[PDB]
Design a protein around this ligand. Structure first.
Ligand SMILES: Cc1cc2nc3c(=O)[nH]c(=O)nc-3n(C[C@H](O)[C@H](O)[C@H](O)COP(=O)(O)OP(=O)(O)OC[C@H]3O[C@@H](n4cnc5c(N)ncnc54)[C@H](O)[C@@H]3O)c2cc1C
Ligand SMILES: Cc1cc2nc3c(=O)[nH]c(=O)nc-3n(C[C@H](O)[C@H](O)[C@H](O)COP(=O)(O)OP(=O)(O)OC[C@H]3O[C@@H](n4cnc5c(N)ncnc54)[C@H](O)[C@@H]3O)c2cc1C
Lengths: 394, 394
């Protein structure tokens, strides 16, 4: 079995890369540990940058998104009994963000891939990577008990945080940067209309809360909870009572509640590895970096890693410029670090941290007061929120 | 002995308030623990905001400053082998800062006060404050062994961080916010021409360094040093060698060194008290708050506290609007907290902190890269550096 680019992981990253590659004539095979159904069960992302929206259009998978996606021109931040709106469009020079669930984006790509007839092996068990520095690397996996080998020119590790690709790079060649936060996000999906037409991020003494959405009749809410919490201790009723307690009274007042379609706790973490490649293996998305959800940058960074890898691979195949691939990491990391900085900043000003002294609490509040009340402060949030520009290459 | 406003402390705050008051016809007496010579020996500040410059003009003490002061339109920040200039004037909408030593400003005010014949008691020993909540407060002090009493209507505590005024407010009525940094600034004054026409703040792996000035032939340099250092362990030669090691090679190359006229270590600290008044006692300047020097806000915040107190006292005396004085703290604290936030931010991005993990070091570097490379980021630094606007009152 042979292909040009072997892709590990059928999440957004792998599917997007595969689609862009297939369309340009570069054969690729995707290997996924789970089933199509399992991948589709993951709720995750709701906010997309314009760069991601354009990439989906380039991959020709934007019909449903253009129809069903919601374009947002602003977002709200509530703190100390007041709501402040950040006009993203005005402050960023015209850019906006699009609310379209990750489940939907993944569904669209999966359908697009099937229609084109490109190769995808689900339930590819025990994927192993070999000869990463040779001229002929290969991947081995198990399908129903028999060990199969897939030869390729390059391997793109799009297998997420717990994937095999990052583990395959000799640990001594990698530099890891990580911060674990002492809290997580308890999320709840409901078939109820959102409380607002725009997102509301709330810093409240009891903890952080976020009112998001998926469509006109589907909402997604989150509340900060300590790491010791188990999802089974949070009944739907306990969640709604808690969410209401963390929102401004006039917002809590018009909130339509309902049974949860999904509930889960996601721990917050920052993680980056340098470099993002090794020989003929290139890491993309959650395989190379994790950002806390506060900034809505994760899936969006994966999109830029992919956009970059795809363009470099095109140059390598179409133009015989294989040496440009050595620049992958340097190009990606520039954008990754600025997005990590933004996600870290958002996280630190919106959440309540344990054992915080009086000085820090006051500085936290003043950070909000300053950035939300200054035209220059508002602009720094806005340009980062809509997403910083992608790098050209070369 | 009787007056209208008793002022404790003959540093910049007390002298400026006294001068503004005297000029408006409100009698005031200043009590100072030290001698004129001792006060004049303190080097301290070099950078003044435009608001402070205007206040000095209003007090009619700006002749020498207008002649000798240096107007700066920009400042430089060096980090990771690169120098980035922040165009203050362009980015702040036309404002600049003025470099005029605190020693000089204090000298100008002292001369101005003497010429007008206003009362100033130097070597006023053991100042005590009494009947702060009565309609008739009074101050007692010792002059050559005899205890004297000074009756007044109001008392302005302009006695700095170690003054008696803040100690006179029942501890239970005060809320203190404080952060002590694990390092100090070793400063050196020399009769040598500055290495640059504008200030250079440098974040270097060995520690922070700052190239400042007092005139065309007088320089002021600083290097971050741990709290365990004693000034006697730093010979002039050790200082120059260290400073040179922390600056970009092309800057170190043209640095003119020379014998120190003054050397001292100043520990870094953030401190604020709420409220800033009690009965007929009002705190101003370092008596109510300390900001680390990194942002050049200390003397500048004292100026705004004074501008505010003076205007409220005018209303009280001239207009019989004594009730407006209850607003002093609320007005001052708004500006104080934003300046504290700025000084804290500058301090955290420019200095090297002990036991810093890899993630934080990278975030520190990315903060600099972001704010120094974005038009909106540059504007947040600039508007804060030139000084945020004073509040109108009423
Ligand atoms: C609560 C939450 C909210 C978020 N909100 C947002 C948001 O609004 N906006 C945004 O930009 N980001 C957001 N994110 C982040 C975003 O969901 C992720 O960054 C994104 O899923 C990354 O996609 P990926 O394809 O890189 O990895 P994944 O989605 O993790 O997919 C990796 C795939 O690889 C497969 N795989 C793993 N191991 C193997 C193996 N050994 N062999 C083969 N296949 C394997 C996995 O099964 C998986 O299907 C959020 C995340 C969370 C958890
Ligand atoms: C290294 C350094 C650099 C700085 N750089 C700058 C800068 O460039 N720009 C800026 O804005 N700020 C800067 N500052 C801060 C600035 O110097 C101070 O904020 C400023 O001195 C405050 O003035 P003040 O009048 O409130 O207090 P002080 O200058 O401390 O004067 C208070 C006076 O009260 C007197 N006194 C004390 N106790 C008694 C008592 N019990 N009875 C009677 N009198 C008493 C003291 O003797 C003193 O004379 C810097 C400070 C340092 C240390």
């Amino acid at each position: 079995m042979k292909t040009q680019v072997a892709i590990i992981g059928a999440g957004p990253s792998g599917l997007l890369l595969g689609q862009l590659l297939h369309k340009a004539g570069i054969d690729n095979v995707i290997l996924e540990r789970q089933t199509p159904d399992y991948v589709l069960g993951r709720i995750r992302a709701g906010v997309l940058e314009q760069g991601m929206v354009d990439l989906l259009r380039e991959a020709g998978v934007d019909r449903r998104m253009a129809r069903d996606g919601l374009v947002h021109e602003g977002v709200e931040i509530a703190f100390a009994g007041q709501r402040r709106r950040i006009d993203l469009k005005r402050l960023s020079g015209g850019k906006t963000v699009t609310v379209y669930g990750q489940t939907e984006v993944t569904r669209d790509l999966m359908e697009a891939r099937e229609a084109c007839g490109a190769t995808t092996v689900y339930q590819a068990a025990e994927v192993r990577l070999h000869d990463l520095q040779g001229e002929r690397p290969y991947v081995t996996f198990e399908r129903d008990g028999e060990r199969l080998r897939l030869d390729c020119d390059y391997i793109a590790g799009c297998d997420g945080f717990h994937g095999i690709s990052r583990q395959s790079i000799p640990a001594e060649r990698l530099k890891v940067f990580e911060r674990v936060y002492p809290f997580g996000w308890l999320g709840l999906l409901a078939d109820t209309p959102p409380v607002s037409h725009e997102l509301i991020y709330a810093n409240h003494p009891r903890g952080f809360a976020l009112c998001s959405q998926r469509s006109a009749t589907r909402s997604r809410y989150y509340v900060q909870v300590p790491l010791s919490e188990k999802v089974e201790d949070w009944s739907d009723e306990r969640f709604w009572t808690e969410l209401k307690a963390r929102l401004p009274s006039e917002v809590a007042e018009k909130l339509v509640t309902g049974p949860s379609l999904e509930k889960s706790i996601a721990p917050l973490r920052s993680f980056v590895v340098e470099p993002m490649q090794h020989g003929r293996l290139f890491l993309a998305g959650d395989a190379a970096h994790i950002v806390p959800p506060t900034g809505a940058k994760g899936l969006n960074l994966a999109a830029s890693d992919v956009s970059t890898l795809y363009r470099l691979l095109l140059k390598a195949y179409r133009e015989g410029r294989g040496e440009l691939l050595e620049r992958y990491s340097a190009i990606c990391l520039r954008r990754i670090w600025k997005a990590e900085r933004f996600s870290w900043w958002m996280t630190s000003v919106l959440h309540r941290f344990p054992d915080t002294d009086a000085f820090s609490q006051r500085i936290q509040q003043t950070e909000l007061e300053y950035y939300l009340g200054s035209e220059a402060g508002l602009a720094t949030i806005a340009e980062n929120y809509v997403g910083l520009p992608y790098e050209e290459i070369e």
